[model samples]
Target: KCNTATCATQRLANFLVHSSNNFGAILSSTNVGSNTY
Candidate 1:
């Protein structure tokens, strides 16, 4: 049970980090494009 809980928590944290990074990348790209234009 402890192992399962740890695994679930790790997975959730990883997912959140991945999603944040993805969003940040897109936002940065958009900002760059706007600056260029």
Candidate 2:
């Protein structure tokens, strides 16, 4: 899923933000492309 640059960057940002602030992880997932998260 994180094979490309865009996906990788988004995933990394999501992980960092979620780990640091405990929010936006799932929101990012939905905004990325789908609502599966």
Candidate 3:
């Protein structure tokens, strides 16, 4: 669970980076928030 391929700390940081990128997209979208909408 702590290997480079799936390290928890690294994964969490990566996940946050992805979320940050998406936040900009969502904010500019006509239908904000949930992409499912």
Candidate 4:
């Protein structure tokens, strides 16, 4: 789950990425980790 994108290993990662990207604009206003981008 660290960096791989395989089907079995990417369920959570994919879900997170999908949710984030799907709501990218909305989340842009919310702060992430401090200066971590």
Checking candidate 3 for backbone clashes, the offending pairs are none
In order of appearance, the predictions have TM-scores of 0.36, 0.38, 0.33, 0.28
* Predicted candidate 1 versus true structure: per-residue lDDT over 1-37, tens digit per residue: 2336668887668767787755675677743365576
lDDT of 3: 0.62
Q: Which candidate is the best by lDDT?
A: 1
lDDT of each: 0.63, 0.61, 0.62, 0.53
**Per-residue error at 4 for model 1, in Å?**
4.8
Candidate 1, pairs of clashing residues: none
The total number of steric clashes, by the backbone 3 Å criterion, in model 1 comes to 0
lDDT of 4 by residue, 1-37 (tens): 2345466556666657677655663457333432365
Cα miss at 31, model 1 (Å)?
Answer: 30
**Which residue runs does candidate 1 get wrong by more than 4 Å?**
1-4, 20-37
For residue 12, model 2's alpha carbon misses the true position, in angstroms, by 0.2
| Candidate 2 residue-wise lDDT, 1-37, digit = tens | 5567778888778777668444553555654436443
Q: For model 1, what is the error of residue 11's alpha carbon versus the real structure, in angstroms, after optimal superposition?
A: 0.3
Per-residue accuracy of model 3 over 1-37 as CA lDDT, tens digit each: 4546657778678758778656675676633544465
